[PDB]
Design a protein around this ligand. Sequence first.
Ligand SMILES: Nc1ncnc2c1ncn2[C@@H]1O[C@H](COP(=O)(O)OP(=O)(O)OP(=O)(O)O)[C@@H](O)[C@H]1O
Ligand SMILES: Nc1ncnc2c1ncn2[C@@H]1O[C@H](COP(=O)(O)OP(=O)(O)OP(=O)(O)O)[C@@H](O)[C@H]1O
Ligand SMILES: Nc1ncnc2c1ncn2[C@@H]1O[C@H](COP(=O)(O)OP(=O)(O)OP(=O)(O)O)[C@@H](O)[C@H]1O
Ligand SMILES: [Ca+2]
Ligand SMILES: [Ca+2]
Ligand SMILES: [Ca+2]
Ligand SMILES: [Ca+2]
Ligand SMILES: [Ca+2]
Ligand SMILES: [Ca+2]
Ligand SMILES: [Ca+2]
Ligand SMILES: [Ca+2]
Ligand SMILES: [Ca+2]
Ligand SMILES: [Ca+2]
Ligand SMILES: [Ca+2]
Ligand SMILES: [Ca+2]
Lengths: 361, 361, 361, 124, 124, 124
Amino acid sequence: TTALVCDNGSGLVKAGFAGDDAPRAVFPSIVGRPRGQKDSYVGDEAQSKRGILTLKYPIEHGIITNWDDMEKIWHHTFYNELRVAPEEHPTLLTEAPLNPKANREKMTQIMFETFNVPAMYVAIQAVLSLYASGRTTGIVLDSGDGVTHNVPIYEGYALPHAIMRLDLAGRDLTDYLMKILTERGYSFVTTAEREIVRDIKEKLCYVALDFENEMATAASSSSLEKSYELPDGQVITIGNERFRCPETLFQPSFIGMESAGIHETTYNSIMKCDIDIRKDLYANNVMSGGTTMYPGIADRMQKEITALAPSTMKIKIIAPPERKYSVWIGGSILASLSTFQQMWITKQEYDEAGPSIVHRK
Amino acid sequence: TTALVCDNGSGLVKAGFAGDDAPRAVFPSIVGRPRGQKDSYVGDEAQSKRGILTLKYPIEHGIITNWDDMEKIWHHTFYNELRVAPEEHPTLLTEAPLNPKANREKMTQIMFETFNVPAMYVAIQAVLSLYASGRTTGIVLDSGDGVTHNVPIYEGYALPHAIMRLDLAGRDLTDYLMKILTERGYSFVTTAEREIVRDIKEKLCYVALDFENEMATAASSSSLEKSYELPDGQVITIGNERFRCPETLFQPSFIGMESAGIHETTYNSIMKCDIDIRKDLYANNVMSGGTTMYPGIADRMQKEITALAPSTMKIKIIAPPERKYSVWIGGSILASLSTFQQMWITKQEYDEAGPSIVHRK
Amino acid sequence: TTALVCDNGSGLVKAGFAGDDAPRAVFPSIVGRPRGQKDSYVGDEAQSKRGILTLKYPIEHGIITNWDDMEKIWHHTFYNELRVAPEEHPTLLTEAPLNPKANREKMTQIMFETFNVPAMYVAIQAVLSLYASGRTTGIVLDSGDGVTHNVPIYEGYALPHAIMRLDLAGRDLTDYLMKILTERGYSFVTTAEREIVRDIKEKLCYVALDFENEMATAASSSSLEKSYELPDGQVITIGNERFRCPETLFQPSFIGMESAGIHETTYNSIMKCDIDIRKDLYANNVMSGGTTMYPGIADRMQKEITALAPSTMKIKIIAPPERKYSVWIGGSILASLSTFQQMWITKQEYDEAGPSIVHRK
Amino acid sequence: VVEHPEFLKAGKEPGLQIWRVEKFDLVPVPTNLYGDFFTGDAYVILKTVQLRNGNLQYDLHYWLGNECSQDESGAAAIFTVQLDDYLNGRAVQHREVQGFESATFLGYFKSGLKYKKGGVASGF
Amino acid sequence: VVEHPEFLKAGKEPGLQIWRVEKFDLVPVPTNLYGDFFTGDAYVILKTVQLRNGNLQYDLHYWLGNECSQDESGAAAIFTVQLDDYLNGRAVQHREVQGFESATFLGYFKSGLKYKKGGVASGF
Amino acid sequence: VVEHPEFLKAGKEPGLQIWRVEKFDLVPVPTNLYGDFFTGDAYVILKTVQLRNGNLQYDLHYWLGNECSQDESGAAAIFTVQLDDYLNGRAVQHREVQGFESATFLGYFKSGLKYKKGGVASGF
Ligand SMILES: Nc1ncnc2c1ncn2[C@@H]1O[C@H](COP(=O)(O)OP(=O)(O)OP(=O)(O)O)[C@@H](O)[C@H]1O
Ligand SMILES: Nc1ncnc2c1ncn2[C@@H]1O[C@H](COP(=O)(O)OP(=O)(O)OP(=O)(O)O)[C@@H](O)[C@H]1O
Ligand SMILES: Nc1ncnc2c1ncn2[C@@H]1O[C@H](COP(=O)(O)OP(=O)(O)OP(=O)(O)O)[C@@H](O)[C@H]1O
Ligand SMILES: [Ca+2]
Ligand SMILES: [Ca+2]
Ligand SMILES: [Ca+2]
Ligand SMILES: [Ca+2]
Ligand SMILES: [Ca+2]
Ligand SMILES: [Ca+2]
Ligand SMILES: [Ca+2]
Ligand SMILES: [Ca+2]
Ligand SMILES: [Ca+2]
Ligand SMILES: [Ca+2]
Ligand SMILES: [Ca+2]
Ligand SMILES: [Ca+2]
């Protein structure tokens, strides 16, 4: 048989087979139920049936909040997307930093008792990303669609007490971009159009190295102007919006948040760690997740941490090319190692010890 | 004449006069000897002469371990602190739960033969605290600087077979806080600075109602952050450390102990008692000692016992305002009662029956 | 023919053939009579018919109290257990220390006149045990189900004037354990459950070397905890109960007795003997009977006698591995010796001299 | 505590005996006043019942008013223990709090309880 | 990860132990080849030192060639952690990159390092 | 126990008499073998001394080898008592254990003791 790798995020599900260099299936982690049709839907069909369904996101800020919808998602992942028999494959699942013990236990229980998998495993997302970048020590900046985390890792393991979290990620960036574009007299807030804003964000947005100077530049010339062909026809163009949208990550107050920006939470995370490993961490900032894809993001982080760290500190920001899938790749690698055969948690061990064996020492 | 009340603890001595509502003298139960000065010192001077003395704690986990230093302490208590002539006052002393018969006898012998007191008495600390809270039945959680005890008491008397003990108290909490602060690049481990850590602990630390959620909260915002002005100048601030330090009482493994936490030892103590008095005990958990002063401690205990007891059980946690001195107050009240005149053990009875009369029936 | 060996105790009957290394039959010395069935029962059937019978113990504290039930027991021993014809075998019976002359005579009369044995003999239990341990001089601590005795023996014979007795043995230990377990909310006091308590006692109980320190240890950790699988299902666990139960032998007041403990009665027995044989006795304390089977018992006795004897005295406690059957084994050996043929008391001698010949010179 | 005169005459007959804690001492309450409790004080109540065979049983209640000082509630609790010991421990102890007394306790007072403000000063 | 045979014989004696990542597995390098590294591969290096009292200390290095595939650099990093855990976590971990290795690492190879082109194919 | 023939001839003259326990019986040892003891057996030794006035005194020793079976050590102890009784109780009894015999006992054998492995089978 061949193990399965499933990375569940606030916005997208990444699933596939261990040994593969990338996820075979990537769909929205959305469940649709009748709000006359009587079926409930998952992912892209759920979105296509917006008008007759009520959509919900099973995962909120990286944490599973609705287990019945989460079950549908996993069911749709096995039988529809991957087309496999769960009972047939050991499955490695991923979990967000600081996931409550109860969630880990309930995930385990459902896999074994509902899907009857022969074996399973639960890994922290940030750790899988660090591994993907060929590193055992560093601080990961993981930013996806629903949450952003700072995770300092040392010799293979996360330091829980130092983890920072920020409820600000892609979806917040899309809403903001959608807001500033609506103000200028447009409208989406629908489906193919809300789809359009996200697409404008992922294709035209970037992070400014120096926000004031970019603003001054955008105000003085059309050099930063960009155009986007709408699916209807008209061509909308944007200038300072391009970098104003992502700037929110560094200045949460742009959308009403009192929290510190990602450069500040990265610094605070490092300052919360043992003085003797901080150099390891400053020299190994690894970016992970779709919201770290913005052009300019790494240079900006490098500059802001530099302004906060000791003048002699070697500061390095690492931005892997496929960091949209780092977490999945890291899991694919892990579940593939010859040494991993004895790391799975088997049905036997479960049926004999209970969901509690999903924790470690 | 007026009786004297002396409560000897692992870290502090509480002494004064029966009839008083609080202890006149409170100093460290420390003895310093020359490690060039040739005098030996007690309490706060002993600490001031750290550099020329070797400090020892006569009481270890509530039990007297070094009688020659204990004699110095009592000498310093009478002549220096209280300024009285021992031979002049009947003295009530306190003893820890499960104190060996030999210790009780040796305490008696020293008081009579070395200090020549006219009369004395030995009371169990936990029992004096329960009395202080206006109760004859209940289970006391006494936690000071060196030891923590669970003492179930019924109609005035302790149930020895049900007593639980945990070698984890304040000093352990200060060392831990000192450890996590040193890791972040600070240093004390000295005197005025070790003094500083204890002070940070007693002013900023508190017990979390739900540890994971507090951790999540501290990781997501600065709402739990607190600052402390060091005596030099810089301002150190702490967040999750505030509740991580006291959490050790519920999870001993935070410092390397394999023992159960205080909620569990309280429960086991109750389950060791006669089924017919357990309701008395669940409804009367009385906290006592300085380490029970943490804000949040009572609510947390209430919640954890509730999760362990029968669903219909009335669970109540009592936290007296001056529980740092409950033991002394209870002794002050006891030695003052008109009925107590005939309860003392007089020199006559001693000189005639020996240290053995210090035990009961 | 082959002689029969019958050791009658307060709780168990040990019977078999001289020459054998162990008793062929071991059953409860209980007689059941109708309290509708009209038969009376002995031993294990008697217990199985609890509900329709009234159970009585023919032997009280080692002494036969009811001769009609004692006759039933012996009848059941010959015909049911051993399946032999009494008239066919010489029989050696055992008697407790300080047995009244009248009992010895009545035992003799019944054997000859009721069972028609061809020859018989009566031996003191403690003496048979000493012989079993390869010794002619020493002080035996015999403790069974109903009584405990200190028997100093010199060059083959007991010293009656020095014998000590304590009406505290196994049954008292089982009742006590049963009492403390009931207090914690359990119930037996029935049959298979009263059977359960005895079994917990014989498998989990042990004697503490130092009672206070063990108590302190049991109060400070779960290191002395033990679990027992009840026949229904639930698993009950015990800690200090394990050594609290046997401690009663050293402190009779745990169950309300004003008597001295076994270490004290052993010492008093020795001090009652001629100063010139005391060294023989201190160096030869031999344990005998089922209640001496507790792990830790020998070390504790060794320590307590040491605290009472002269500092230069060589103190040794001997604990034979099959001391549950020492008395029977010693009788088996005795009745087997080639020199024993002329020691029996024959029917002739009886029919000619009367029950009185059962005494010695 | 045999030699206090109050202990001498405690539990000698069926009925109620009510004492009030006064500066570390137990002072008997005038029988005609059984039922009135100063909310700023603490009291010890002994209920003695005679069985058909003439034997007596005891129930000890210590009542604490919402405004009593620690010394009084402390003494009341200590006195209850001592009185129980003096009665060879045969008494059953009951803590009674103002506004929440047990049915049994409330049953000792036909015309109900009267909580009056004030009381004796603390012995501290 | 106890039951891999490579882990069984890791850190049992003073000296160098060099393994190369090969299709998700750790394959030992021939002792006579210690020092040659394919730039297209990833390796795990364990340095064991014996102290004067016979106790052993460990230093783990995972070397990444500039042309190794992600699966190999990933595995090398995971193997280092596992090997460290197997050694009760006593090993100190070091990431070594081609052309920029630490002085300590370079010090393990008297006759310097030999970076040769090529290596084993990716396990993807 | 008068009628055993061994008892008849016991203590009739100054010297040593050595018997070995054999399946619940006392069997005399060949005088030329006095001193050799099978460690798996038990023996009874009678030392008879003649005083200047012709009277005899007795000292009884029962020797137990570290490998004898309970039946033998038991019989040896019972035989010693019986032999002492037959001698009107005038004998002084001594328990002797292999490797720890008393000086007196060791003194009966000029050319020391010889402990040889084995012996007679248990009578059980
Ligand atoms: N090229 C890009 N530029 C900017 N944003 C992008 C790009 N590609 C994807 N994204 C965004 O990053 C977000 C997604 O990431 P990921 O797939 O990392 O999220 P999750 O795992 O679904 O969410 P979370 O990690 O927050 O629980 C999406 O919301 C998407 O809009
Ligand atoms: N407000 C407070 N918050 C937290 N801890 C406090 C507070 N006040 C005092 N303490 C701590 O409680 C401990 C002291 O108690 P106490 O005076 O109760 O101890 P002891 O009697 O000296 O010790 P033990 O009872 O363990 O033998 C001290 O170590 C001190 O640090
Ligand atoms: N392993 C054991 N541990 C503790 N007690 C045991 C053990 N085995 C047997 N016993 C107990 O010892 C007692 C029995 O002994 P024995 O057979 O010695 O008694 P008796 O001869 O029946 O009584 P007695 O000698 O008092 O007249 C029983 O009550 C039994 O519970
Ligand atoms: Ca994610
Ligand atoms: Ca710099
Ligand atoms: Ca204390
Ligand atoms: Ca409840
Ligand atoms: Ca017996
Ligand atoms: Ca000695
Ligand atoms: Ca008052
Ligand atoms: Ca009582
Ligand atoms: Ca390669
Ligand atoms: Ca390590
Ligand atoms: Ca033999
Ligand atoms: Ca003799």
